[PDB]
Design a binder for this molecule. Structure first.
Ligand SMILES: [Cl-]
Ligand SMILES: [Cl-]
Ligand SMILES: [Cl-]
Ligand SMILES: [Cl-]
Ligand SMILES: [Cl-]
Ligand SMILES: [Cl-]
Ligand code: NA
Ligand code: NA
Ligand SMILES: [Zn+2]
Ligand SMILES: [Zn+2]
Lengths: 97, 97
């Protein structure tokens, strides 16, 4: 329950932030496997500056989280709701209509 | 599987279209119960013109569908992936961090 105006505004901000091709590419990468900024940048052919900027935004909205491992920051989808939202959307885009 | 560039572009368009407060309100209403344009308009205090415009957009992206019942067009979330995506996002926005 607890669907009030504030909730739907935050939901709106989540979808607004995800309405970005490169952010979707970052999120899909993290949906397959957690990764560092250097690995995301290398895999997607995006600069480390840019990846870091987008991940600061995604983190502020609780869409990714980060932990320090050895020397680096490892990012992941924040929790199972974010993973489920994303994978359900990808499958829906993919399956025939 | 089948995560290619086209898929992620369509995913991007889905999240872009959902990055809209009133469209989120329409989608949440439909997530509770299917409804006609007149009922959506009345419940959300949005004009029928506007509701109809937003639903044409949401339908073109396979996010809602419509059936004719009696005299009116009844809209609903397109399938279970759309409902799941939306409700998971709402819950994630709601729960504590
Ligand atoms: Cl992982
Ligand atoms: Cl870049
Ligand atoms: Cl399916
Ligand atoms: Cl229903
Ligand atoms: Cl209006
Ligand atoms: Cl939970
Ligand atoms: Na995936
Ligand atoms: Na709901
Ligand atoms: Zn589907
Ligand atoms: Zn969550």
């Amino acid at each position: 329950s607890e669907i009030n105006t504030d909730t739907l505004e935050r939901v709106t901000e989540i979808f607004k932030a995800l309405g970005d091709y490169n952010r979707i590419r970052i999120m899909e990468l993290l949906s397959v496997s957690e990764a560092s900024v250097g690995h995301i940048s290398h895999q997607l052919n995006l600069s480390q500056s840019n990846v870091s900027h987008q991940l600061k935004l995604l983190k502020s909205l609780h869409l990714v989280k980060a932990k320090r491992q050895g020397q680096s920051m490892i990012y992941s989808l924040d929790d199972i709701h974010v993973a489920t939202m994303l994978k359900q959307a990808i499958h829906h885009a993919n399956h025939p209509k």
